[model samples]
Target: GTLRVAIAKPAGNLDPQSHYAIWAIQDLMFEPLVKYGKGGQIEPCLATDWKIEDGGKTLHLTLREGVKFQDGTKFDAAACKWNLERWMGIDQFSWMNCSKHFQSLEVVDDYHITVHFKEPVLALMQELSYTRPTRFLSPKSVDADGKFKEPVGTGPWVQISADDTQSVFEHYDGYWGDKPTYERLEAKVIPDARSRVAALRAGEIDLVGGFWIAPLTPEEGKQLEAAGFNVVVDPGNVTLVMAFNPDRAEPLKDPQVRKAVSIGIDRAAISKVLYHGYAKPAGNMFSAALPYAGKQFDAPVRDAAAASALLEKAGWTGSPIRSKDGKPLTLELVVSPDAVPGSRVIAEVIQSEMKEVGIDLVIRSVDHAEQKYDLGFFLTYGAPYDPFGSLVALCLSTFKNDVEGKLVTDPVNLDPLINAATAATGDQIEPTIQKVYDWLRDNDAIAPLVYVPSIWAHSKRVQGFTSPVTEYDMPYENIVLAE
Candidate 1:
């Protein structure tokens, strides 16, 4: 049980034609032709077996057996179609849309392959259980100027070094399966959650695989499990939103000034003042733990006098900070300094509850990989048992319907039920993912404001500590830290 992590930051782009976001040893440093078993089911690493079959648009796979790679190569099916055509012929690895309808790769040799799809994807293992964009590398990792090389895999750890404070892998003693009694998997970046809890109470490090890298307050993990240490909370797999991308600006393209900024916030008193009970006020934006998404969708009714009578029927007014033709309704709430943890005290309690609905919030603080903003409030993870990775980045589309003047960004009324949950399956995949979470809770476009539990803090000298309790996990490589 050889594990040694303290990560919370400084480890992005461990090579996938240059990291396409999402990490924390994403499925432990690459290796996934298939994974995410236990309850989310669909196992068989490096494709030991898969078979979607043509009607569902073909997948086939098989592969694994005497695997190899941490540079030794082997792992066939043409190294899994040369790491899926170098993750769709590069171009900085197109952030996991993996060449959309993907229509090729059929090896059918060195241990079978197939793939071939253009339609009816049936969630194809929820698009290959999003391993930070389907892992797997090492067709000689790629080099001679094409980019990623030196990073071979068949992972069980191997990197060996990663600057900017520390990253060290080294356990793959040519591993192919079940060989992690610890041989060096150190991570160390510690962005200070009291300096990763004083480097795990001063042993320098023995845990802390991810509590968002270094974030502990709110009872610092119940004072480090009351100073005994072995806290594995990690819940919120992403929800903190506020988005209003109406192409990014202006009265947020005014829909009654966006339903008076969606029911005029008070998400259960900002979920009892910044998750006092560890989150849950997000009334309903799919992920009441997903599947049939019960309690029949409705969350948005704070009615601050119907949000001041829907911003005076969209003309807004003033003295709570609103205007009209002179421009001054002011709305710049973009928070992303790793937002979603009492985001600046819930953006100063929605800037004092949008200055009592005249709307004036101005919190800025950007960097969700910067792209400047208009109104965002970040944190999104609708992947609760996959349904097109949670509507491929929050889907929305409701147009003109009846816009008396301005507020309409319905590019041809967008409604992409990802090919109807990729041509459905199993009771049509939970009501086809509850009609894409009921069109993302009736296109509030993004409101869901609470429920952030992805906690993971350990220390009681570690031991087979199953992290993230597998709703989707592949971490710590089977913990064990005692002598």
Candidate 2:
């Protein structure tokens, strides 16, 4: 039998609209670049080579001459430009979300393409390696409605069966690169974590992907390792923060009050209790893994007494919980129920801590989509190489309105400071990130917590599953079953 994999997801349309769907579809299609080798370097895939010009503002790409979509559509410069234009028109496409990074795409010739950017993006090449809807799409795949009906791309696999909940892909016999060892790949949605784990253990699947592992006991780790399986863990580039809506509340608008609140919670304690010390306390919004991360980005330590003193100095009198106009201070803390377990635990802990500090904290649990639109703070994750992308999304005022029907004004804009830092180079990235960090701390818009580590357990029978410290999802093409 071919290598079978069990993902913690159930059946779903393998469309580019969702991250899960994109992950599966990426394996079916060929990308222009890929993160290859041990250092996660970006190298040629469909495109033979590319050159950066205009001080990194423009990218000239020379496509590999013989590449073709599974449906026999020629993969050329024209196809690349068409796909990018389509992505610009659709919000669901990942590239649309990063529109600021790109200004235009020009088809130079049958085999050449040029991409112009609004600003110098040092990571654009690496960014393109990931599966995004802007990735080259065959012209024949689009429908009259402008939606993909039967998606076709220059990839190693071809879609065989698909529905709302599941999809199956078979090896494209005419694939241009090295053929896959597996004959077919099936993706099914299994939302229940336990069921997914059970499937892996029962040999119903040879591998399991995209599920969280709680803080494991030493004994459990040893047992799993002893069972002919390997456990990989690395700090995620993402951070969980507590944000306040400046418009809805009073003291929260005051820098002193916000700083007081930041000083009240014990991050080290939260890390120990919630993550069993498996996570690292976040120093700032950007993870330490980034070359630009700095010590100045570290969040201030907890000082409950100092926090109380600051509140006293801020002219609060009656019940220790005084609003801007001497009314009782009662504010809600919104969180997503589907957030990481550690995130929920930290939110609950902060709620208790804030109550002790004379601030009324109300905990509210909501669905993920609702939380995205809500003014309240929620746990969010971003990839490592592009932590700036998250910063741009959550803190930059410019990107707020790009996603239609989404909330505007994040109340956490750090655009001014980031803009100043973009011109700096080398050792300046850290100091620039620090400047933004100082602003975030002073504004009290966002409260930093800890950097969570991604954990995964896979049988030793799985080969070539190199753990990337930046992204949790391992590259699919690199994975193969051991004979």
Candidate with top lDDT is 1
The 10 consecutive residues of candidate 1 with the worst lDDT sum are 399-408
Per-model TM values vs. the true structure: 0.38, 0.69
Tens-digit lDDT string for candidate 1 (285-379): 54544434434555565778888887877787778588888887877776654734456777788778888987887887655343256676645
Model 2, residue 480: C-alpha shift (Å):
4.6
Question: Can you write out model 2's per-residue Cα lDDT over 235-345, one digit (the tens) per residue?
Answer: 666666666665666566777777777788888877777656556777676566554555545556778788877877886544556554647656677666564454456
Q: What is the TM-score of candidate 1?
A: 0.38
